[PDB]
C-alpha cells in the first residue's frame, strides 16, 4: 500500500489492527503520512476544491490545514485552492545549462587529448 501509495487504503487498514502495541507506532505512521499528503498533492495539480481536501485531512475544520496554509504557501483561496505560481517556479532553464553544457565538453575534449 506504500507503493500505491496509501493514504486512504492504509486509513482503512489502520482502523483494524490486532495489533498489538502498534498504537505507539501507528501514531508516528499517522504524522509521517499526513505531511506526505501535503508534499505529494502538489506539485503538480492545477487546483483542488476545499471540502475535497477536507475529506483527506479528516477531522472537521482542523488547525492542521491552517498550519498547512502557513507551511505550504502556496496559496489559500476562497472555497478552493491553487498551485500558483506557477506549477512551480517555471524552469526554462535558458542560459543556466549552457554553462555545464560547455563544461561537460571541456573534460570531454580532455578525454580526446588523453588518447591522444
Amino acid at each position: 500500500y506504500l507503493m500505491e501509495g496509501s493514504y486512504n487504503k492504509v486509513f482503512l487498514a489502520k482502523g483494524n489492527i490486532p495489533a498489538e502495541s502498534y498504537t505507539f507506532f501507528i501514531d508516528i505512521l499517522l504524522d509521517t503520512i499526513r505531511d506526505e499528503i501535503a508534499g505529494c498533492i502538489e506539485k503538480a495539480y492545477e487546483k483542488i476544491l476545499f471540502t475535497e481536501a477536507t475529506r483527506i485531512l479528516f477531522f472537521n475544520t482542523p488547525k492542521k490545514m491552517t498550519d498547512y496554509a502557513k507551511k505550504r504557501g502556496w496559496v489559500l483561496g476562497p472555497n478552493n485552492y491553487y498551485s500558483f505560481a506557477s506549477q512551480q517556479q517555471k524552469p526554462e532553464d535558458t542560459t543556466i545549462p549552457s554553462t555545464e553544457l560547455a563544461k561537460q565538453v571541456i573534460e570531454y575534449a580532455r578525454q580526446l587529448e588523453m588518447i591522444v
Partner: protein, 140 residues
C-alpha cells in the same frame, strides 16, 4: 518456463494477470528464494500501465481509467498519479473538479542532454578499447 510466463505477465499492464502467476507458479519461487522481488514488482507493474496510458492518451478520465487497470476505486486514481509526478513518471498536469486528467507532449530539450550523457560512456569506452589494444600490442 514458469519464470518466462512471469516476465510475460509483468510487461503487460494487467494487474490481475500478474497476480495469477504468483499463485500458480509461486511454488517454484520458494526454491529460488526470489519472493524478495515479488512484493516490490507490483510498483513497477502499476508504473508501467500508467506510463502506457500516459503517452497513448491525450486526455484521460480518472474514474474511467480504474476499470481497465482494476484500480477499483476513484481515490487511488489520484494516488498513483501523485507519486507518478513525484517520481517524474509523467509531466501531465491534472485538474481536480470532476475531476479530469490532461497530458501534454514536450520535447526539443531531448537530444541536448541524453546523447551527451551517453557519449561520455561511449568515448571513454572507445579510448579504453584503445588502451587495452595498445597494452597487448606492445608485448612483442
Amino acid at each position: 518456463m514458469p519464470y518466462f510466463l512471469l516476465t510475460q505477465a509483468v510487461r503487460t499492464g494487467n494487474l490481475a494477470k500478474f497476480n495469477q502467476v504468483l499463485d500458480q507458479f509461486g511454488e517454484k519461487f520458494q526454491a529460488d528464494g526470489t519472493y524478495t522481488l515479488i512484493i516490490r514488482l507490483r510498483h513497477n507493474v502499476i508504473k508501467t500501465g500508467v506510463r502506457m496510458i500516459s503517452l497513448s492518451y491525450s486526455r484521460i478520465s480518472l474514474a474511467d481509467i480504474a476499470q481497465k487497470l482494476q484500480l477499483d476505486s476513484p481515490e487511488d486514481a489520484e494516488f498513483i498519479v501523485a507519486k507518478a509526478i513525484r517520481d517524474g513518471v509523467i509531466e501531465a498536469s491534472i485538474n481536480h473538479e470532476k475531476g479530469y486528467v490532461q497530458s501534454k507532449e514536450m520535447i526539443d530539450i531531448y537530444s541536448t542532454r541524453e546523447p551527451q550523457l551517453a557519449f561520455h560512456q561511449r568515448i571513454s569506452f572507445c579510448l579504453d578499447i584503445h588502451n587495452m589494444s595498445v597494452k597487448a600490442m606492445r608485448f612483442p
